[PDB]
Ligand binder design. Structure first.
Ligand code: BTM
Ligand code: MG
Ligand code: MG
Ligand code: MG
Length: 340
């Protein structure tokens, strides 16, 4: 049961949850990876990692992925949560130089991950290990696209560092643009492709129905995170959240902002249902009788199916994960799973 202020009946009724069969092995393998890569202290891994549910989030999303593809994705995803925590702590503690150096190393490791597998910063070496594995599944054209997208993500994190150090809350529209980058919309969208075993040609993945379905899946996920992570973000002096932009720039009360975010999330669902029909019609059109057409049709169908799965995976993750349970913490501003 989800509390009424966060409950989305359409998700519960029309987006049934799915779980990849590799999940039990994935859970342990990513936990071990966090420990062995020294991304979290051993005691925090043992106490918190499984309860954070990072592998459950990916195993409810990339259905049909080969096990080793899912493992690379789950390691990258867990890494990205640890990176969000590092970024937050660098801001809180005023470590502008350490953040700037990490930012530069991530840009370089993204282009040459093999070179960084044994870097002295374990966060950099862990990133490089997951990215090198992701780069082994599809042609180098996909790797170049992943890199282009992630360079843009790193710079969005840098912009968040500057906003928080200056005490600036972005306006609503500025925030919505930024959030497509800090949530890594295009990375999750890129990762659909190794999960279904096919790099999609530009003409296919830029078809308006594919693009719009991909966008709406991510807008839902990011704004639902904003809705559910608002309490811990207020407690932590985080400024990046649609609800915070609405309160700051449109004078909404907390209750009014929650209602507005919820309505925007709900609309993403029914806009997605409409565009999903068009995206699946496009998948049917790709099945032109040829072998390549069958492959592309099947890949698009699998990808759109996972765009749909993201809704339910993200929904349930926010109720299951210890990451958001601010009411349980000794210090609401310092989650117990971060290294402070
Ligand atoms: C902070 C982690 N993340 C990607 C894992 C940003 C890089 C946003 C996110 C939060 C919650 C669910 C899904 C993604
Ligand atoms: Mg965060
Ligand atoms: Mg963040
Ligand atoms: Mg959040």
């Amino acid at each position: 049961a989800v509390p009424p202020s966060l409950r989305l009946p359409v998700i519960e009724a029309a987006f049934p949850r799915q779980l990849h069969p590799y999940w039990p092995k994935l859970q342990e393998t990513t936990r071990t990876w966090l420990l062995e890569k020294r991304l979290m202290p051993a005691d925090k891994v043992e106490e918190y990692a499984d309860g954070l549910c990072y592998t459950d989030l990916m195993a409810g999303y990339y259905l049909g992925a080969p096990d080793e593809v899912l493992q690379a994705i789950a390691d990258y995803s867990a890494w990205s949560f640890v990176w969000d925590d590092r970024h937050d702590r660098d801001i809180v503690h005023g470590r502008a130089g350490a953040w700037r150096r990490l930012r530069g190393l991530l840009h370089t490791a993204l282009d040459s991950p093999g070179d960084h597998l044994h870097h002295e910063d374990t966060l950099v070496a862990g990133f490089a290990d997951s990215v090198r594995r992701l780069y082994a599944f599809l042609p180098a054209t996909w790797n170049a696209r992943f890199a282009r997208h992630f360079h843009t993500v790193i710079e969005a994190y840098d912009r968040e560092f500057h906003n928080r150090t200056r005490g600036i809350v972005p306006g609503v529209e500025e925030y919505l643009e930024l959030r497509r980058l800090t949530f890594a919309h295009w990375i999750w969208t890129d990762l659909l492709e190794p999960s279904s075993g096919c790099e999609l040609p530009d003409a296919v993945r830029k078809h308006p129905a594919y693009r719009r379905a991909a966008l709406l899946s991510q807008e839902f996920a990011a704004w639902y995170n904003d809705l559910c992570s608002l309490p811990k973000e207020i407690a932590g002096d985080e400024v990046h959240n649609l609800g915070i932009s609405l309160i700051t720039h449109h004078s909404l009360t907390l209750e009014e902002a929650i209602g507005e975010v919820r309505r925007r999330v709900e609309e993403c669902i029914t806009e997605f249902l409409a565009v999903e029909r068009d995206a699946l019609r496009f998948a049917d059109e790709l099945a032109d009788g040829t072998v390549r057409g069958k492959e592309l049709s099947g890949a698009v169908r699998a990808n759109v199916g996972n765009m749909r799965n993201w809704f339910s995976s993200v929904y349930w993750f926010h109720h299951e994960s210890g990451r958001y349970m601010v009411d349980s913490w000794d210090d609401r501003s310092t989650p117990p799973y971060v290294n402070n």
